[PDB]
Design an enzyme around this catalytic site. Sequence first.
Site, PDB file in Angstrom:
ATOM      1  N   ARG B   5       0.796  -1.227   0.000  1.00 26.60           N
ATOM      2  CA  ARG B   5       0.000   0.000   0.000  1.00 26.60           C
ATOM      3  C   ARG B   5       0.826   1.273   0.000  1.00 26.60           C
ATOM      4  O   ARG B   5       0.322   2.390  -0.198  1.00 26.60           O
ATOM      5  CB  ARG B   5      -1.022  -0.071   1.134  1.00 26.60           C
ATOM      6  CG  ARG B   5      -0.434   0.137   2.477  1.00 26.60           C
ATOM      7  CD  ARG B   5      -1.547   0.378   3.547  1.00 26.60           C
ATOM      8  NE  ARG B   5      -2.441  -0.760   3.599  1.00 26.60           N
ATOM      9  CZ  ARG B   5      -3.772  -0.745   3.459  1.00 26.60           C
ATOM     10  NH1 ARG B   5      -4.496   0.372   3.279  1.00 26.60           N
ATOM     11  NH2 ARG B   5      -4.389  -1.897   3.541  1.00 26.60           N
ATOM     12  N   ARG B  96     -11.629   7.723  14.906  1.00 26.19           N
ATOM     13  CA  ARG B  96     -11.963   7.329  13.520  1.00 26.19           C
ATOM     14  C   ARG B  96     -13.355   7.859  13.252  1.00 26.19           C
ATOM     15  O   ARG B  96     -14.369   7.281  13.705  1.00 26.19           O
ATOM     16  CB  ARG B  96     -11.910   5.818  13.293  1.00 26.19           C
ATOM     17  CG  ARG B  96     -10.503   5.292  13.555  1.00 26.19           C
ATOM     18  CD  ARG B  96     -10.521   3.785  13.834  1.00 26.19           C
ATOM     19  NE  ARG B  96     -10.786   3.036  12.595  1.00 26.19           N
ATOM     20  CZ  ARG B  96     -10.406   1.761  12.442  1.00 26.19           C
ATOM     21  NH1 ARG B  96      -9.766   1.154  13.435  1.00 26.19           N
ATOM     22  NH2 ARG B  96     -10.641   1.100  11.318  1.00 26.19           N
ATOM     23  N   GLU B 100     -14.052   5.153   5.666  1.00 23.92           N
ATOM     24  CA  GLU B 100     -12.810   4.430   5.414  1.00 23.92           C
ATOM     25  C   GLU B 100     -12.885   3.610   4.152  1.00 23.92           C
ATOM     26  O   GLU B 100     -13.939   3.060   3.803  1.00 23.92           O
ATOM     27  CB  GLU B 100     -12.576   3.473   6.569  1.00 23.92           C
ATOM     28  CG  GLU B 100     -12.339   4.304   7.843  1.00 23.92           C
ATOM     29  CD  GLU B 100     -12.067   3.495   9.097  1.00 23.92           C
ATOM     30  OE1 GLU B 100     -12.037   2.251   9.054  1.00 23.92           O
ATOM     31  OE2 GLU B 100     -11.891   4.147  10.160  1.00 23.92           O
ATOM     32  N   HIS B 102     -11.468   0.286   2.532  1.00 21.62           N
ATOM     33  CA  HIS B 102     -10.868  -0.987   2.967  1.00 21.62           C
ATOM     34  C   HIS B 102     -10.791  -2.006   1.864  1.00 21.62           C
ATOM     35  O   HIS B 102     -11.511  -1.895   0.918  1.00 21.62           O
ATOM     36  CB  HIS B 102     -11.691  -1.557   4.099  1.00 21.62           C
ATOM     37  CG  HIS B 102     -11.449  -0.835   5.398  1.00 21.62           C
ATOM     38  ND1 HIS B 102     -10.253  -0.942   6.097  1.00 21.62           N
ATOM     39  CD2 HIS B 102     -12.216   0.053   6.082  1.00 21.62           C
ATOM     40  CE1 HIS B 102     -10.322  -0.168   7.181  1.00 21.62           C
ATOM     41  NE2 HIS B 102     -11.495   0.449   7.184  1.00 21.62           N
ATOM     42  N   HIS B 103      -9.852  -2.962   1.974  1.00 21.17           N
ATOM     43  CA  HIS B 103      -9.760  -4.026   0.957  1.00 21.17           C
ATOM     44  C   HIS B 103     -10.590  -5.211   1.343  1.00 21.17           C
ATOM     45  O   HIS B 103     -10.544  -5.689   2.487  1.00 21.17           O
ATOM     46  CB  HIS B 103      -8.291  -4.401   0.763  1.00 21.17           C
ATOM     47  CG  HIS B 103      -7.539  -3.266   0.153  1.00 21.17           C
ATOM     48  ND1 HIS B 103      -6.958  -2.247   0.917  1.00 21.17           N
ATOM     49  CD2 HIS B 103      -7.343  -2.937  -1.143  1.00 21.17           C
ATOM     50  CE1 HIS B 103      -6.428  -1.360   0.098  1.00 21.17           C
ATOM     51  NE2 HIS B 103      -6.608  -1.766  -1.153  1.00 21.17           N
ATOM     52  N   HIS B 127     -16.787  -1.181   9.772  1.00 25.43           N
ATOM     53  CA  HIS B 127     -15.517  -1.886   9.559  1.00 25.43           C
ATOM     54  C   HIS B 127     -15.099  -2.716  10.788  1.00 25.43           C
ATOM     55  O   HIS B 127     -14.597  -3.864  10.677  1.00 25.43           O
ATOM     56  CB  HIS B 127     -14.365  -0.926   9.277  1.00 25.43           C
ATOM     57  CG  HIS B 127     -13.082  -1.652   9.105  1.00 25.43           C
ATOM     58  ND1 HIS B 127     -12.068  -1.674  10.051  1.00 25.43           N
ATOM     59  CD2 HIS B 127     -12.678  -2.450   8.099  1.00 25.43           C
ATOM     60  CE1 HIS B 127     -11.088  -2.449   9.607  1.00 25.43           C
ATOM     61  NE2 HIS B 127     -11.450  -2.957   8.446  1.00 25.43           N
ATOM     62  N   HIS B 131     -14.621  -6.655  11.225  1.00 26.77           N
ATOM     63  CA  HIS B 131     -13.320  -7.178  11.649  1.00 26.77           C
ATOM     64  C   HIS B 131     -13.417  -8.075  12.890  1.00 26.77           C
ATOM     65  O   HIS B 131     -12.758  -9.119  12.983  1.00 26.77           O
ATOM     66  CB  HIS B 131     -12.453  -6.010  12.031  1.00 26.77           C
ATOM     67  CG  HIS B 131     -11.145  -6.419  12.638  1.00 26.77           C
ATOM     68  ND1 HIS B 131     -10.138  -6.961  11.879  1.00 26.77           N
ATOM     69  CD2 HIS B 131     -10.708  -6.428  13.922  1.00 26.77           C
ATOM     70  CE1 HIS B 131      -9.117  -7.266  12.663  1.00 26.77           C
ATOM     71  NE2 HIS B 131      -9.439  -6.953  13.907  1.00 26.77           N
TER      72      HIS B 131
END
Lengths: 80, 134
Positions: B5, B96, B100, B102-103, B127, B131
């Site tokens: 990245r 946060r 976002e 994200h992959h 997210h 997770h």
Amino acid sequence: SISDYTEAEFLQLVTTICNADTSSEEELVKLVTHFEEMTEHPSGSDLIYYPKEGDDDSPSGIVNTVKQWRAANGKSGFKQ
Amino acid sequence: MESKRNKPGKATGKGKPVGDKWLDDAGKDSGAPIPDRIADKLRDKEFKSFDDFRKAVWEEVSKDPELSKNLNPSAKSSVSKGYSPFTPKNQQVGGRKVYELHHDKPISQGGEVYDMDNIRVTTPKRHIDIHRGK
């Protein structure tokens, strides 16, 4: 705390945030966080970005919403 | 290991058609896709890092009348600078506070960095919920 700012200083801070007049996203997030901490308002950053229908979301609008909420809830106001 | 990245790459992929509530979708399911019209602007361009790509995504959101339509003027000022916009308070996690990127397939498991079909837009809350269930 908010009572360390005059209303004028607080209007400058809110205007910085609303215009995104910062050097980086990180700096803008720090400022919004500080704004939340000063206002103590349960809506946090939503005052700026997700205002209730009928609220004036201009910088002077947000300053007035904060001022009135703090007054209604027996909290300290601005310096001066 | 060296971090992919943080190396340059070329954006690829198609994204998906989205509507007015696109960012509302970011707090549900696996988040929102990259909008097709943003993929169309960024496809084949080279970016210096994933963070550079992220700034380009938000810059493109600012330029698209439909995708920025339900950002308020303060949110618009932010995305016009390439910043990610703030989510609603109820979708933030600690410091946060913004959407976002994200992959979906992790880079470590073969997912590509700049493949716009492998990227999802989530709130911090969504997210973190995804997770913690892994």
